[PDB]
């Protein structure tokens with residue numbers, strides 16, 4: 114019954130930084146006497162227990178066998194680029210197309226995230242990203258793992274997108 118969230122995007126856009134921040138804000142210790150030591154950590158976002166995974170496709174993951182498995186298992190996807198990395202924005206479409214193909218669905222919960230919005234070097238405008246998100250039919254939000262701007266909102270929005278999808 115857990116919501117399965119997957120964070121995708123080019124290397125270095127801040128997927129780990131965003132996910133670490135979310136866990137730091139929202140992890141709790143839950144009593145469960147049916148497990149070994151009786152307590153397990155979990156993340157609760159907007160009243161939903163959430164599992165979290167990060168999908169990289171470059172670096173060490175250039176050798177991975179698991180890309181499609183991440184996309185099949187994930188129920189909603191944070192598609193992250195960095196506002197100071199034009200290439201990472203240009204990479205977004207490929208990730209979305211792969212997810213849609215692997216899941217064989219036109220209705221996949223997603224949120225477009227423009228991270229590193231605290232940095233003064235901007236090469237991807239808000240308008241560009243909002244136009245892309247509108248074409249996809251998904252929300253767009255700008256975030257900064259450094260200043261914490263938008264981080265919680267990005268994950269909370271994705272949870273609501275998954276919730277609506279499961280309501281259908």
Ligand SMILES: Nc1nc2c(ncn2[C@@H]2O[C@H](COP(=O)(O)OP(=O)(O)O)[C@@H](O)[C@H]2O)c(=O)[nH]1
Nearest residue numbers: 123124125126127128129130228229257258259
């Ligand atoms: N200024 C700034 N730097 C960030 C932000 N998020 C991540 N970084 C930095 O970008 C670099 C790569 O981030 P990382 O989380 O490893 O990206 P990943 O490869 O997508 O998981 C690190 O040095 C982070 O400190 C942000 O919002 N603002």
